Amino acid sequence: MTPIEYIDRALALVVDRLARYPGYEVLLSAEKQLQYIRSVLLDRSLDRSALHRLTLGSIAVKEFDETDPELSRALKDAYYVGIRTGRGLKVDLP
């Protein structure tokens, strides 16, 4: 997947899970963070300071590692896209 595809994959899963659990704050937070990553991937002129305030990785492992491994995987990968982007490094995912 391209980096945007990893973010849109995670957003697809978050939206699917919000239909199962409407209003669930963990998922609303994850959506907002994914949209932020998406924005900075698409436009390099936007401020990137908030990349170091992401909690998506923590959400993946503390909320979903047992209950939703599919979502946890997508959030781990999206978090990795975010932090590699913030650190100026290639997104070296397949």
């Binding site: 199962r20 659990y21 209003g23 669930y24 704050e25 963990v26 609303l28 937070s29 907002k32 963070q33 908030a50 305030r53 992401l54 909690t55 998506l56 990785g57 923590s58 993946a60 492992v61 503390k62 909320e63 590692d65 047992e66 209950t67 939703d68 959030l75 781990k76 990968d77 978090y79 990795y80 932090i83 070296d92 995912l93």
Partner: protein, 137 residues
């Protein structure tokens, strides 16, 4: 980040690698820790009581608290979880465990939950699930 923060990050990175987490995923596990506070590896002896929040209907996880008085938010978790069979949001359950074997754990302070996208408590991490026995609730 300063020399202490970088050392705490390296302690965590080394620990997660040794417990079969690859480097990209290890970043997410590290995102659960606040490297501005000490991160240390300890070995627990058998007989240590610990607690763990879990969604209802979910199996054992990897994160533990040292006391049943610690609340979810300070641990970086939501007080509500997911009941998958019922498709409902319901309070997390607090389960009790006791170490059954000597086991190495990563001790740190949580990155706790604040309102940016809307103090931290201490936590232990171990993915050696069989070293922590579920107690009656």
């Amino acid at each position: 980040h300063d020399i202490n923060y970088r050392g705490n990050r390296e302690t965590a990175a080394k620990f997660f690698k040794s417990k079969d987490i690859d480097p990209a995923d290890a970043e997410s596990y590290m995102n659960g820790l606040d490297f501005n506070h000490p991160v240390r590896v300890e070995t627990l002896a058998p007989g240590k009581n610990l607690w763990q929040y879990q969604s209802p209907g979910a199996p054992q996880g990897n994160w533990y608290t040292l006391s049943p008085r610690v609340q979810p938010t300070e641990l970086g978790i939501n007080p509500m979880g997911t009941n998958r069979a019922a498709n409902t949001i319901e309070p997390k359950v607090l389960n009790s465990y006791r170490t059954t074997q000597k086991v190495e754990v990563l001790r740190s302070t949580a990155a706790p939950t604040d309102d940016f996208w809307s103090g931290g408590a201490q936590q232990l991490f171990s993915n050696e699930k069989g070293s922590f026995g579920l107690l009656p609730r």
